[PDB]
A = this chain, B = another copy of it.
Amino acid sequence: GSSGSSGPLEREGLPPGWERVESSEFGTYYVDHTNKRAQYRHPSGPSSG
């Protein structure tokens, strides 16, 4: 329930299909199997609809 700036993370787990990668050189990133891309923010989809 954002007040104008939703969080970049929610502490919760990723959606089914998203993977989190963790290392010492880069820190932590996320990969999208649906689009074969990498990002640094948490993913966002309509879990209920």
The residues of A with any CB-CB pair to B shorter than 8 Å are: 17, 19, 21, 23, 25-26, 29, 31-33, 36-39
Contact = CB atoms under 8 A, between A and B. Distances in A.
A21 B31 contact: yes
Contact of A21 (B21, B25, B32, B37): B21
A36 B37 contact: yes
Contacts of A21: 19, 21, 31
A30 to B, nearest CB: 10
Nearest to A33: B26
A33 B19 CA distance: 15
A31 B26 CA distance: 12
19 contacts: A17-B25, A19-B21, A19-B23, A19-B25, A19-B26, A21-B21, A21-B31, A26-B33, A29-B31, A31-B31, A31-B38, A32-B38, A33-B38, A36-B37, A36-B38, A36-B39, A37-B37, A37-B38, A38-B38
